[PDB]
Amino acid sequence: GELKREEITLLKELGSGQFGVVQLGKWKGQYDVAVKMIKEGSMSEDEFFQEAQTMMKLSHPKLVKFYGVCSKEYPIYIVTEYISNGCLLNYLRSHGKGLEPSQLLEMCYDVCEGMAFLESHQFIHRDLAARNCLVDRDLCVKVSDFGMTRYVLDDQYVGTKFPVKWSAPEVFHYFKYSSKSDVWAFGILMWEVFSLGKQPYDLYDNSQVVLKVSQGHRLYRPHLASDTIYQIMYSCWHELPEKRPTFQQLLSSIEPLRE
Ligand SMILES: */C(C)=C\C(=O)N[C@H]1CCCN(c2c(F)cc(C(N)=O)c3[nH]c(C)c(C)c23)C1
Ligand SMILES: [Cl-]
16 A cells, blocks of 8 residues: 655665665664665556555565555655565575575575465566575565566567576567466576576577577586475476476475475
């Protein structure tokens, strides 16, 4: 729902997000928040504000908590809880010396559990990647910004920022987004986690990745991934969406491996 703009105090810039500037703030003199600044003309506002009511209801412990919006003037505020360790990708890249396989599996489990919740509500993320998940002070991973690419108005010029390297073939060929394309992206995220934040298909440009993935190329097993864990991420990358597991099945598959 709608928040009172003056009940948000902006404290410092967190950086430039996919959707604009993001600020650390305080809400109601009590709660630590992140505030996404949404500029005029950047979003299909009608569609977004309908979905903003959906975002508010889609609450889960492994989803970043959405508090509300300030929508009556620009910039629009999207207000979420503050998650202190920032994006999962940079966490991996700066904590690899201390991270062990059991913790890496727990990170994947957290994301899978949030995604199973979204799947159960027929909600498609569209842009799952380690860069888009957040790590809290207790190393719980939370899914963030789910669904937000749908309301972006700017041409992505599919040089492009379009996330080909996380995209199932039906996404890069047909732009067909589904919970099964989210599953493909989840497998790529599992690879990012177990590789301690490597870039997928590092030596290759987007055109090379479309051809190689179309021809059956898949990411190699990270050193820290067991055969069982590799089989889980690899199962996410079937050419056919109907041959990929659901997030409910993946969650089932990961649970017995936790330590
Ligand atoms: C990783 C590869 C990226 C990254 O951390 N990017 C930044 C860009 C600025 C905004 N960032 C951001 C955010 F959007 C939300 C939160 C939050 N809900 O707490 C957040 N916390 C931190 C510490 C950052 C940097 C955050 C992500
Ligand atoms: Cl590796």
